[PDB]
């Protein structure tokens, strides 16, 4: 088939920038290439139709270009709204085929986090499990360690974390990390600590709680 | 004004059929192509293949030959595709699209989750505020399928809240968390629910979540 390969796949832009994400095709395509938009749990949007051309509704920011197997979706000054996902979409031949994609995540200024730990409640416990949980809010950018410590033995396969997508009013991610243990294994030690290095704290947050202590 | 409109999430046990619907309105129904996509979670779309309503033409992605089976009805402007002997690996987001030669009109998407798993509501838990701007909430857990709901005191807290998104736990079962930040001199002085729902086992629950005496 036809393979369309994309580059970037990842891109932070701070808004009034310009960007131009590229998409290279495994064979000639004629102009039939497109570009697409896509927001979280939307269908995706046109962008660009035929390498080049207009679509209806689409901001004038937006603009295509190439020819031959190299194509480039060009943005000039990027806005607060034009976070998403970019593809570009081949319909030259069956079977239609698009690439990896590429996410314009939108860039701001360093944020640390706000760390916060949660013991398990009572009520879960006597059910048998401990949710231990520690809370990273508000912070950018996105990376970050986040390690779990009982009774100061650095704990490893024995939690999950989840992250929220670019808060649609300040731009910045929260995260939340889930040490599950048994009641039995939560309640042979005391002292429970989460650890956060982040690129805006000078050094790592430490938000712990002691199980002798209310 | 074009349109196209997919049903609703399903939900089934591997080795299942699914059948997902794409309604067109706006055109002659048997005019235009209806071509039908899967989007994997943090993925690409991959085509699946496409059919003409009026003639019953289709055309076929060889990868979906055995998956997938497009009929339509142009009485009822309604396109279908079935996917059949389901497995894990077809849990994906379904779009049909209408044939423009690009792809201007989409439906909104189909869920479809495949698992072992069976109907289970969650059980909520205080996510309680430090013994020394605050922080709280709840911890949705054990349930199956997606999706819960979260609100805070019925929709009159809205601000400082994050609900993450579910993780898939090793039993099957997804896991939540939904919190909020408040002032720190508020937690003696008030009350803070939050309101779960999860349709699917019919769980509406509203949970106190107090500091710790």
């Known amino acids: 088939d036809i393979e369309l390969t994309q580059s970037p796949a990842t891109l932070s832009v701070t808004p009034g920038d310009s960007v131009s994400l590229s998409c290279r095709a495994s064979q000639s395509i004629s102009n039939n290439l497109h570009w697409y938009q896509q927001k979280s749990h939307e269908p995706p949007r046109l962008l660009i139709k035929?390498?080049?051309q207009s679509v209806s509704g689409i901001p004038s920011r937006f603009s295509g270009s190439g020819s031959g197997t190299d194509f480039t979706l060009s943005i000039n000054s990027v806005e607060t709204e034009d976070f998403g996902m970019y593809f570009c979409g081949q319909s030259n031949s069956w079977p239609r085929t698009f690439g990896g994609g590429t996410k314009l995540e939108i860039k701001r200024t360093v944020a640390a986090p706000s760390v916060f730990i949660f013991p398990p409640s009572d009520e879960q416990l006597k059910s048998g499990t401990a949710s231990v949980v520690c809370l990273l809010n508000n912070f950018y950018p996105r990376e970050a360690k986040v390690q779990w410590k009982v009774d100061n033995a650095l704990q490893s396969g024995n939690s999950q974390e989840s992250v929220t997508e670019q808060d649609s009013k300040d731009s910045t991610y929260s995260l939340s990390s889930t040490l599950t243990l048994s009641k039995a294994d939560y309640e042979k030690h005391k002292v429970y600590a989460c650890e956060v290095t982040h690129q805006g704290l000078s050094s790592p947050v430490t938000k712990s709680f002691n199980r002798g202590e209310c | 004004q074009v349109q196209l409109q997919e049903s609703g999430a399903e939900v089934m046990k591997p080795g299942a059929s699914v059948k997902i619907s794409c309604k067109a309105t706006?055109?002659?129904?048997?005019?235009?192509?209806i071509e039908w996509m899967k989007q994997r979670p943090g993925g690409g779309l991959e085509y699946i293949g496409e059919?003409?309503?009026?003639?019953?033409?289709?055309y076929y992605n060889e990868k979906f030959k055995g998956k997938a089976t497009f009929t339509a009805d142009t009485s009822s402007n309604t396109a279908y595709m079935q996917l059949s002997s389901l497995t894990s690996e077809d849990s994906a987001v379904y779009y049909c699209?209408?044939?423009?030669?690009?792809?201007?009109?989409w439906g909104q998407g189909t869920t479809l989750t495949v698992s072992s798993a069976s109907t289970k509501g969650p059980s909520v838990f205080p996510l309680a505020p430090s013994s020394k701007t605050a922080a709280l909430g709840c911890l949705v857990k054990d349930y199956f399928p997606e999706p819960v709901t979260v609100s805070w005191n019925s929709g009159a807290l809205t601000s400082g809240v994050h609900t993450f998104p579910a993780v898939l736990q090793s039993s099957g079962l997804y896991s939540l968390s939904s919190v909020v930040t408040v002032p720190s001199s508020s937690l003696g002085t008030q009350t803070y629910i939050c309101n779960v729902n999860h349709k699917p086992s019919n769980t509406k629950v509203d949970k106190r979540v107090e500091p710790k005496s």
């Open positions: 035929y390498v080049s």
């Open positions: 699209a209408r044939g423009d030669g690009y792809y201007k009109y």
């Open positions: 059919i003409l309503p009026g003639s019953g033409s289709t």
């Open positions: 706006g055109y002659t129904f048997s005019t235009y192509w």
